Amino acid sequence: MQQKLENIKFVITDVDGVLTDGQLHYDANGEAIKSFHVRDGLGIKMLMDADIQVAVLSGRDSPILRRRIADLGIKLFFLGKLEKETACFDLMKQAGVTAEQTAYIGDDSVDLPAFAACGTSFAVADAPIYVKNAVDHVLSTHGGKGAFREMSDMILQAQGKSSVFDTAQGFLKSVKSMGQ
Amino acid sequence: MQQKLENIKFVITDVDGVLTDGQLHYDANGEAIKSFHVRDGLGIKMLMDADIQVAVLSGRDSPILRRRIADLGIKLFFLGKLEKETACFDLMKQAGVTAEQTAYIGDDSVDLPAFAACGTSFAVADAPIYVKNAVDHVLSTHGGKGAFREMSDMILQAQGKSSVFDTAQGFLKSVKSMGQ
Amino acid sequence: MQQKLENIKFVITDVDGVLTDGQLHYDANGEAIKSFHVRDGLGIKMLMDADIQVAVLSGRDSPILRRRIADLGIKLFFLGKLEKETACFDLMKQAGVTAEQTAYIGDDSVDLPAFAACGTSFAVADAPIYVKNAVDHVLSTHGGKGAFREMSDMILQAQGKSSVFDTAQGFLKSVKSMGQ
Amino acid sequence: MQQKLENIKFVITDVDGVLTDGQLHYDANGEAIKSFHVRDGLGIKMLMDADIQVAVLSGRDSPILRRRIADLGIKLFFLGKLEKETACFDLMKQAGVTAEQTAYIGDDSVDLPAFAACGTSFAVADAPIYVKNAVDHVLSTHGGKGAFREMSDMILQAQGKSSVFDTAQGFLKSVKSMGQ
């Protein structure tokens, strides 16, 4: 992992089930609320702040997801498309990174093809076994409970940038880039 | 039970307690939010995509639920039904199948007569003791945490159709009917 | 407990913390959502159906709660008052029962007075120890996860009325009265 | 802690991850819902009632949070502030107390500088190990599950004021200052 982690320059995360606990909160009008986790966002920022682009590939789309994407300043992303293989390379071309430079975090079958495309994949804790068996690393955290952060934390760990989340001083350093 | 699982051409699921964790999110106007798990949605489609029909039979009726049912493309169902036996038999007839080819996943006492009516019956992990004792298989996933997907996975697996969720290759092939 | 239980004719429950997980869902305007558990609802209906009245006591009054109280068909209740002692006596006089015939289920310091006024008291699994200390029976289910159902099943069982919930036929006989 | 606890005359609490479980429930417009635990709510009031001021320092700012704040009667706070060191000192000045007289409860990296600035610091149970390593005391309750209340009880206890949450009498005596 140390191997591939240090080489990551681009992170692609699914949304529902990863940045989310997979719950689709409906009201009479369809998707009404989507729950993201505050620690994941800080992690997204810490990555970006540490020269590591972050994009979301979601087999779904909603103004809610878009808003969250905008709050976080994510620039690269693909929504509504359930085929993830070509979508990743398309994100990779856009980021000027190779497969070997992009990590991916998923939770379901829909992500099986993105794990094949990115070379460095993550599975959230509550992911089913066929997904766990198809990734490089299984997270201890459940989707939506900080799984992404667990990943960002370890990517920034291996690349010697942990000080940003490790300590009061390292954090106050990148303080002007932690918002969401 | 692989036998039962292989005969299943029809699944009837309860809503509150199975497709959700049993929480009813009230507004001053009654249910204002119903949470559904994306991974359960995917599983419902895969069953459908696999020639296995799906029906909903809730003890409660809400437009929120009716919207979720429509999103999933489920045509057979009954809502607000606390008497589930008759409901189960009607649904079977509508699906053109026998009690022998249909499964039912429930969580509480209301589901007891549905159990008796359906060939195969499942209970979510958090179901009371008297519901667990009356089904063929108690699932390990709690209501609302993807217990339906745990079941649909068993069903497809047992009918040699797991490649749909087992792998990149298989999932892609049915990428056409994997929506929510 | 078996003796106290078979004598119960009246149940008074707190709300936030018992019928809910103590979570208060805020939007910019205060409580925006109250989550109640379905199996608790069936519990309340099963209790009333077995000639055991159910009242609700909460320090918080909100149209959301009132809506729930109405769906359940709960007749006696005191809202907005954090001084539960007199409230308990008033409800008991209204219910026409003695303190020895009434059960109270709580979760916080606020409920201590209630425990003392009511013959029988229950605490939800996640109540703090100084609450579990003050009651007759500490339940094993968390507040809002069906602790109330745990208690009602317990009262119904103790009264030779567990049938409505442990048998399809028992349930089907009291079905016209299970609507929440 | 004992010595620390007895001198606490001011508690500063983070919001996301402490008063809540870190989930950010998004609308197409940003945070749509914020869930706060009722017992944390009461713990805040018991603190104030015992002449211990309570302040809030949060990385995010929202009208939902401000509403909770006003309901709890909190006057000192700084929102949207990711730099918490200065803020803690400023709040300390506002409360007329010293770093020694002030406790802080947090859950993530952003809180690191807050822990260092306050005499006594707490971490919620689900905080990252790198946050736990940095606090005076790690609570056993997860953020949003009543971790603030667990701390408030410790403080009051240490000061010989547990009677408010300890007994019916102590509660009633202060019952007029328990609303949230």
Topology:
The structure is a homotetramer of 180-residue chains.
Chain A: H1 2-5, E1 10-13, E2 23-27, E3 30-37, H2 38-49, E4 53-58, H3 63-72, E5 76-79, H4 85-95, E6 102-106, H5 112-118, E7 120-123, H6 129-132, E8 137-138, H7 147-158, H8 163-166, H9 168-173
Parallel strand pairs in A: 1-4, 1-6, 4-5, 6-7, 7-8
Antiparallel strand pairs in A: 2-3
Question: Please, could you describe this protein's structure?
Answer:
The structure is a homotetramer of 180-residue chains. Chain A is α/β, with parallel strands linked by helices. Chain A has a single domain, classed as 3-Layer(aba) Sandwich (Rossmann fold). Helix content of chain A is 39%, strand content 21%. Chain A has nine helices and eight strands. The first copy, chain A, has helices at residues 2-5, 38-49, 63-72, 85-95, 112-118, 129-132, 147-158, 163-166, 168-173; strands spanning 10-13, 23-27, 30-37, 53-58, 76-79, 102-106, 120-123, 137-138. In chain A, the strands form two sheets. In chain A, strands 5-4-1-6-7-8 form a six-stranded parallel β-sheet. In chain A, strands 2-3 form a two-stranded antiparallel sheet. In chain A, α2 (38-49) runs parallel beside α7 and α4 packs parallel to α5. The radius of gyration of chain A is 15 Å and the shape is globular. The first copy, chain A, starts with a helix and ends in a 7-residue tail after the last helix. Chains in contact: A-B, A-D, B-C, C-D. The interface between B and C is medium-sized, with 30 and 34 residues. The PDB classes it as hydrolase. Keywords: HI1679, structural genomics, KDO 8-P phosphatase, Structure 2 Function Project, S2F, hydrolase. It forms a tetrameric assembly. Structure Of the metal-free form of the deoxy-D-mannose-octulosonate 8-phosphate phosphatase (YrbI) From Haemophilus Influenzae (HI1679). Chains A, B, C, D: deoxy-D-mannose-octulosonate 8-phosphate phosphatase.
